[PDB]
Design an enzyme around this catalytic site. Sequence first.
Site, PDB file in Angstrom:
ATOM      1  N   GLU A 220       1.011   5.069  -8.278  1.00  8.54           N
ATOM      2  CA  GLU A 220      -0.251   4.702  -7.686  1.00  8.54           C
ATOM      3  C   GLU A 220      -1.221   5.897  -7.674  1.00  8.54           C
ATOM      4  OE1 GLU A 220       0.793   2.359  -4.078  1.00  8.54           O
ATOM      5  OE2 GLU A 220       0.093   0.793  -5.437  1.00  8.54           O
TER       6      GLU A 220
ATOM      7  N   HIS B  11       6.741   1.433  -5.909  1.00  6.79           N
ATOM      8  CA  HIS B  11       5.831   0.859  -6.864  1.00  6.79           C
ATOM      9  C   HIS B  11       6.199   1.316  -8.272  1.00  6.79           C
ATOM     10  CE1 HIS B  11       3.036  -0.093  -3.485  1.00  6.79           C
ATOM     11  NE2 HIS B  11       3.579   0.997  -3.009  1.00  6.79           N
TER      12      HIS B  11
ATOM     13  N   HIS C 140       6.780  -8.834  -3.661  1.00  6.80           N
ATOM     14  CA  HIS C 140       5.938  -7.791  -4.253  1.00  6.80           C
ATOM     15  C   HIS C 140       6.450  -6.383  -4.027  1.00  6.80           C
ATOM     16  CE1 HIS C 140       3.921 -10.749  -1.641  1.00  6.80           C
ATOM     17  NE2 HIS C 140       3.874  -9.787  -0.736  1.00  6.80           N
TER      18      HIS C 140
ATOM     19  N   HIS D 126       9.871   1.753   0.216  1.00  8.87           N
ATOM     20  CA  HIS D 126       9.733   0.777  -0.859  1.00  8.87           C
ATOM     21  C   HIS D 126       9.200   1.516  -2.075  1.00  8.87           C
ATOM     22  CE1 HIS D 126       5.799   0.824   1.304  1.00  8.87           C
ATOM     23  NE2 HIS D 126       5.314   0.811   0.076  1.00  8.87           N
TER      24      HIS D 126
ATOM     25  N   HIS E 288       7.565   5.312  -1.440  1.00 14.94           N
ATOM     26  CA  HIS E 288       6.829   5.527  -0.219  1.00 14.94           C
ATOM     27  C   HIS E 288       7.770   5.296   0.945  1.00 14.94           C
ATOM     28  CE1 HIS E 288       2.886   4.271  -2.353  1.00 14.94           C
ATOM     29  NE2 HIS E 288       3.187   5.534  -2.582  1.00 14.94           N
TER      30      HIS E 288
ATOM     31  N   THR F  48      -1.653   0.639   0.301  1.00 18.03           N
ATOM     32  CA  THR F  48      -2.084   0.182  -1.016  1.00 18.03           C
ATOM     33  C   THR F  48      -1.798  -1.305  -1.202  1.00 18.03           C
ATOM     34  OG1 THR F  48       0.022   0.757  -2.083  1.00 18.03           O
ATOM     35  CG2 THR F  48      -1.500   2.486  -1.834  1.00 18.03           C
TER      36      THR F  48
HETATM   37 ZN   LIG Z   1       3.615   1.697  -0.997  1.00 17.64          ZN
END
Ligand SMILES: [Zn+2]
Length: 259
Positions: A105, A95, A63, A93, A118, A197
């Site tokens: 996000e 998103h 993920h 990492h 992040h 998150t």
């Molecule tokens: Zn994150």
Amino acid sequence: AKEWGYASHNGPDHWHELFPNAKGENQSPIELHTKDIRHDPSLQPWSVSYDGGSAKTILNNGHTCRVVFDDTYDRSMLRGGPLPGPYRLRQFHLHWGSSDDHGSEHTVDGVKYAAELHLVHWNPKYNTFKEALKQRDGIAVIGIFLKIGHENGEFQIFLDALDKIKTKGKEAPFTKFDPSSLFPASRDYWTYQGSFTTPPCEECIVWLLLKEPMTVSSDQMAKLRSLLSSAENEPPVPLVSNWRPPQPINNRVVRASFK
Ligand SMILES: [Zn+2]
């Protein structure tokens, strides 16, 4: 196990079932609204002293794609800002979404970006990262939005490693990389307190969300969203989105470090 995802079945609306923190009162991300934000003249600048040699590995855990740093001692540090002291860089990492017009996000005045980076740090005051998870300011995250434009050369070096982690469970050496190289020109930020998150969604995060987005190419964003959530031999399953929808601000207040 930690079984979760962003599909309608295993997705964000259901995370609280197995991960009860998800339903907490200080969750992230949030929608930012400038009408509801002021400049706080007391907020200080932040700085980092990262050691490119602290980079260790890059992995695909089904993920996201994550880079991991040596945080066994104070090596690569983040200081200042609204932080009480220096924090250790542990990993970064991303998103992303299914197309360029979304994927971040956080949002600012309704605007969504193509992705959000992040960089996760923790406070050695709490001894370990695991214990830091039990403190409202245990972890400090540098959130950087990714917008579409010209190709980012520094980001490209990171993307060049993705071929090694196409599938879930893959992990390869990734050394000599200073992720500060990805930062935009401005260190202007917003800050507020929230959570991861992702499950288990611990409410342990002080957010340093940068005003200025890093720019990457559409083509780079394509590469980023070319990973699979399935393992080396299984039915290929694309990992095309991994962003969590906005959570209730409640009575929290976001502050700006800039006028
Ligand atoms: Zn994150």
